[PDB]
Design a protein around this ligand. Structure first.
Ligand SMILES: *[C@@H]1O[C@H](CO)[C@@H](O)[C@H](O)[C@H]1NC(C)=O
Ligand SMILES: *[C@@H]1O[C@H](CO)[C@@H](O)[C@H](O)[C@H]1NC(C)=O
Ligand SMILES: *[C@@H]1O[C@H](CO)[C@@H](O)[C@H](O)[C@H]1NC(C)=O
Ligand SMILES: *[C@@H]1O[C@H](CO)[C@@H](O)[C@H](O)[C@H]1NC(C)=O
Ligand SMILES: *[C@@H]1O[C@H](CO)[C@@H](O)[C@H](O)[C@H]1NC(C)=O
Ligand SMILES: *[C@@H]1O[C@H](CO)[C@@H](O)[C@H](O)[C@H]1NC(C)=O
Ligand SMILES: [Ca+2]
Ligand SMILES: [Ca+2]
Ligand SMILES: [Ca+2]
Ligand SMILES: [Ca+2]
Lengths: 515, 486
């Protein structure tokens, strides 16, 4: 009845150079020892056929991994001794399933780390020996100290083998701060083969989709969430020619997409819900809008508007009010100028304590202008331009606490962030950058970032520092020629979309990183 | 032929005071900046149009403006041409203004259609912008001078479209993504202008550029001897005889129409045929590698069989004016259409309008009045149609004739649809200001003549340079001396 490899005592059994864990072990043997064993790993349920062991010993063995639930089926084991072994990996759940375990020794195995909650779930333990191992003290071991504090078991002092700073320090003595290990980041998730001028997001029927304008095919691309494998897939398209900006607008659970094209373009589409296809609604006047660089969506005082910047001398930047059956011309702006970008922001204008709607549009070879809407005339007036600024492409805004700031993109020279004072923007931060077609502020979970795109250089992602009151260098994205950056929020999931003019579009995950 | 040759536009640029202020008040900054604009426009013309833009001269106003720059591009253009007529003494094919201000119109510049080589007409005005952008503005201004006018008719029909819609085309409106290219219709318009006799001054190659000599640019500067175009292009022509901008053992020449390979072409070989009956053929001198500068008959020579008269090398007839405004398929109306409708003084023909009334033409002037063509469209190739199309019908003895016209506006003053000044109304008579006058009323300059009642003593043709081009065996500035060479 005694296995051939093992030699058996009356109550005990000893197995040397065994090539497998015997399942035939006779009952009324309460103790089993494996020494210099042939088998290189302990799999799950290997001991299921030997429920009666109160004691288990492993010494002088080389093990690749000790699997989760390897000891399952040993409810009676008080004592488990693993000592003087080479063990490459130890699973978090490896010891799961022994309630009755009293003494446990990992000692003298030269183990570099331990997984969290490896001691989770053993109630009975009165002793643990971790001594005799070389421990690299890092995040992975960060839990250990906490456990050492709150544990009922008796554990003798153990010391860090590494890193060099903490070597020969008591693990129990350590505090969490000394374990370092704090990070935030953006990691590449999906790679889209098509080059994209612009990206936008919208919520239809409490579902957040993504619109991507691919200039060279002329197709306005729609991306929807898919839970099967990857959250981003293409449900639908809108066909066009030389599409530049695709702007969705949802009004009262009715989807409208304004798409501007460089060829016979500037068409307004709406989503017919029954057919769930897009249908052309209106055609923007081709004399008023000719080569739009941009589209900006805003809602003022229980009214919806959208404004189109015309970089042609011929076309006028024009604002289109919504009468509710569609969009129709409201105000022409900045006649005779080439308008690269339009930006809407609500800013406090002294003396007024209330915030007021304002427009900022950027003309090529000209200073950006600010426009204050007047309710009485239902129109902007008192044109004013941002002072001491030369050659901007776009203006974008963000708010930290009550104050508001703007990111001014200059393709050449310095791109800089200004804070709004009582009557004026004041210089705050100046970052020079090379061939920058975008400066994008973003806010994700109350984290303000500023992404400065570059063609010839790397794209520089910055983080807002509340103490310094300026952006701080954060991470460097590689994207071929970004024109845009867009924040997408799925439920509890956050993604960053980077368009690329000369290369494939990039989709990054927003990752929070701990232990 | 004439359109396979490389054409060279000699260009002068004038920078106004605001353009000088944009640069910090630095003359070197303004001048080198405009050299950059010209360089990019040259890169545009070099390939597509087989034409080079060379800057012969420049001046900048450091102190103030010589005339007030107007927000209207056409007004500024007109007064600028007055300036260059009464003041600028430097020889150029075209004189363009660079304005630091901005025009209150979609057009970033204004230039006269078919203006090159003309003292009053040739030129343009261009508003300030970015280097890449202002190069496009100058490209379309020099395109207007060069004869490329968008076919307002083929565009509205959809015949001429831009092959690449992403950026559209030069003759398309300005936008953030600058137009790099001319349509095939544009190139055809340019070829049609060159074959029509316009642009005779574009065929001479400059020698000293405003910038220090560089060997291998394709132009012979001071200190060089020969130049071919590029090291790779040189292999096609000139690589044999030209080494390091210095001639080989036997060469008289490197490249040219008059250089067979390494040697000159014998005197009297024709490098360029006449494009029309207003044009004079040019022969190789045998002293030069270049084809002799392009010259044509002086203004006042009859063309099209006493149906028209040459001006600036181009033939002026009513039929070519009808084809010019309304397209090639249109022909001019029968003389009876004029002889009847124009004396009526209606919108269907007239001598013009005084206060809200048409003037009825006199029987003498009847061919100088409202321009009448046969089957007309509603969309002229150029300008703005004002109002509707005129169509009447007149019967002569079994032939029913259709008389049609329209009012096409370019300048608030100049109006197409009235017979162009210089069109013959009869023998030795031309139209001026809607009136039929004898030739002497134009006070034409003449060449030298040694014989009573002859041009160039009867032995030669009077060119547009006012020099006598002699027939064979005749020599002298008046061609009165008989000197056979065999
Ligand atoms: C540890 O022991 C204390 C009493 O000393 C007890 O209150 C606590 O519940 C024990 N914790 C665990 C995890 O057994
Ligand atoms: C979107 O367009 C691309 C090319 O334009 C096409 O290959 C793809 O199948 C389209 N997808 C949908 C969902 O329409
Ligand atoms: C705008 O004009 C009003 C008067 O019409 C004046 O109260 C205000 O100070 C002006 N704003 C600026 C910036 O000049
Ligand atoms: C020959 O060439 C010289 C320049 O080298 C020029 O001055 C002269 O007029 C030319 N003679 C003829 C007959 O072309
Ligand atoms: C003459 O042309 C006009 C249009 O310009 C047309 O209405 C009319 O029928 C034509 N008459 C004849 C006889 O062709
Ligand atoms: C033409 O000009 C010449 C001198 O330039 C003058 O002698 C002659 O009288 C003029 N004729 C007319 C009709 O003006
Ligand atoms: Ca914008
Ligand atoms: Ca010339
Ligand atoms: Ca040279
Ligand atoms: Ca000729």
């Amino acid at each position: 009845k005694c296995p051939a490899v093992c030699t058996c005592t009356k109550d005990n059994a000893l197995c040397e150079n065994a090539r497998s864990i015997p399942r035939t072990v006779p009952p009324d043997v309460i103790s089993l020892s494996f020494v210099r064993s042939g088998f290189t790993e302990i799999s799950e349920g290997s001991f299921l056929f030997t429920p009666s062991l109160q004691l288990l010993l492993f010494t002088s063995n080389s093990f690749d991994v000790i699997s989760d639930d390897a000891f399952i089926g040993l409810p009676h084991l008080e004592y488990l001794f693993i000592e003087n072994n080479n063990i490459k990996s130890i699973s978090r759940h490896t010891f799961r399933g022994l309630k009755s375990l009293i003494h446990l020794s990992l000692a003298n195995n030269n183990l570099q780390t331990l997984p969290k909650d490896i001691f989770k779930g053993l109630d009975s333990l009165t002793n643990v020996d971790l001594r005799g191992n070389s421990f690299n003290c890092d995040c992975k071991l960060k839990w250990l100290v906490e456990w050492l504090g709150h544990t009922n078991a008796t554990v003798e002092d153990i010391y860090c083998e590494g890193p060099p700073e903490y070597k020969k320090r008591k693990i129990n003595s350590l505090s969490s701060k000394d374990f370092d290990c704090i990070i935030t980041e953006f990691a590449k998730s999906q790679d889209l083969p098509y080059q994209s001028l612009s990206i936008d997001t919208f919520s239809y029927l409490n579902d957040e989709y993504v619109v991507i304008a691919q200039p060279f095919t002329g197709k306005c691309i729609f991306l929807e969430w898919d839970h099967v494998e990857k959250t981003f897939r293409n449900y639908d398209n809108i066909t066009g020619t030389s599409t530049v900006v695709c702007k969705p607008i949802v009004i009262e659970t009715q989807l409208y997409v304004i798409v501007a094209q460089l060829f016979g373009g500037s068409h307004i589409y709406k989503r017919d819900s029954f057919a769930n296809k897009f249908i052309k609604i209106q055609d923007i006047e081709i004399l008023k809008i000719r080569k739009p660089n941009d589209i900006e969506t805003f809602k003022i005082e229980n009214n919806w508007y959208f404004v189109v910047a015309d970089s042609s001398k011929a076309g006028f930047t024009t604002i289109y009010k919504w009468n509710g059956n569609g969009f129709y011309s409201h105000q022409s702006l900045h006649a005779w100028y080439r308008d690269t970008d339009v930006e809407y922001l609500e800013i406090v204008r002294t003396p007024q304590t209330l915030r007021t709607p304002h427009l900022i549009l950027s003309s090529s070879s000209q200073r950006p202008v600010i426009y204050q809407w007047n309710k009485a005339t239902q129109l902007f007036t008192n044109q004013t331009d941002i002072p001491n600024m030369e050659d901007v492409y776009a203006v974008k805004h963000f708010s930290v606490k009550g104050d508001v700031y703007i990111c001014l993109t200059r393709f050449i020279g310095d791109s800089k962030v200004m804070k709004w004072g009582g009557s004026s923007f004041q210089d705050i931060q100046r970052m020079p950058s090379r061939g920058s077609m975008v400066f994008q502020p973003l806010q994700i979970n109350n984290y303000q970032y500023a992404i400065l795109g570059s063609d010839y250089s790397f794209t520089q992602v910055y983080n807002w520092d509340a103490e310094k009151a300026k952006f701080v260098k954060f991470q460097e994205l590689n994207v071929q020629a970004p024109r845009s950056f867009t924040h997408v929020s799925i439920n509890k999931r956050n993604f960053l979309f980077a368009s690329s003019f000369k290369g494939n579009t990039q989709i990054y995950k927003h990752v929070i990183v701990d232990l | 032929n004439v359109e396979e040759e490389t054409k060279y536009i000699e260009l002068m640029i004038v920078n106004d005071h605001l353009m000088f202020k944009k640069h910090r008040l630095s003359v070197v900054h303004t001048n080198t900046y405009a050299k950059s604009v010209v360089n990019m426009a040259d890169l545009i013309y070099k390939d597509q149009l087989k034409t080079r833009i060379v800057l012969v001269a420049m001046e900048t106003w450091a102190t103030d403006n010589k005339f007030a720059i107007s927000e209207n591009p056409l007004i500024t253009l007109r007064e600028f041409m007055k300036y260059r007529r009464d003041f600028i003494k430097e020889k150029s094919d075209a004189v363009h203004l660079f304005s630091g201000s901005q025009f209150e119109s979609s057009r970033s510049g204004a230039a006269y259609i078919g203006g090159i080589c003309s003292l009053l007409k040739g030129g343009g005005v261009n508003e300030f912008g970015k280097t890449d952008l202002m190069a496009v503005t100058l490209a379309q201004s020099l395109a207007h001078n060069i004869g490329i006018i968008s076919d307002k008719r083929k565009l509205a029909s959809g015949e001429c479209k831009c092959e690449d819609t992403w950026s559209g085309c030069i003759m398309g409106d300005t936008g953030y993504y600058l137009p790099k290219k001319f349509t095939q219709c544009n190139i055809e318009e340019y070829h049609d202008f060159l074959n029509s006799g316009g642009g005779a001054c574009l065929f001479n190659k400059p020698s000293k550029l405003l910038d220090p000599p560089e060997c291998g640019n394709g132009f012979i500067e001071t200190g060089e001897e020969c130049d071919c175009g590029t090291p790779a292009e040189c292999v096609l022509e000139g690589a044999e005889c030209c080494k390091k901008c210095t001639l080989t053992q036997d060469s008289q020449c490197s490249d040219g129409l008059c250089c067979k390979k390494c040697k000159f072409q014998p005197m009297g070989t024709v490098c360029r045929e006449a494009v029309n009956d207003c044009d004079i053929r040019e022969t190789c001198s045998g002293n030069s590698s270049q084809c002799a500068p392009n010259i044509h008959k002086m203004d006042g020579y009859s063309c099209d069989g006493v149906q028209g008269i040459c001006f600036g090398g181009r033939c002026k007839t009513r039929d070519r004016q009808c084809k010019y405004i309304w397209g090639q398929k249109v022909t001019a109306s029968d003389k009876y259409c004029y002889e009847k409708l124009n004396i009526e003084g209606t919108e269907k023909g007239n001598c013009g309008k005084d206060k809200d009334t048409w003037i009825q033409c006199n029987k003498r002037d009847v061919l100088c009045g409202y321009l009448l063509c046969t089957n007309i469209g509603n969309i002229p190739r150029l300008g703005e149609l004002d109002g509707e199309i005129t169509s009447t019908l007149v019967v002569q003895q079994g032939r029913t004739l259709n008389c049609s016209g329209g009012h096409v506006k370019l300048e608030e003053d100049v109006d197409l649809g009235y017979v162009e000044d210089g069109t013959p109304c009869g023998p030795q008579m031309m139209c001026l200001e809607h009136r039929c006058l004898p030739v002497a009323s134009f006070n034409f300059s003449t060449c030298l003549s040694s014989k009573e009642g002859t041009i160039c003593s009867g032995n030669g043709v009077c060119s547009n340079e006012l020099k006598c081009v002699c027939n064979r065996h005749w020599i002298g500035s008046d061609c009165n001396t008989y000197f056979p060479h065999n």
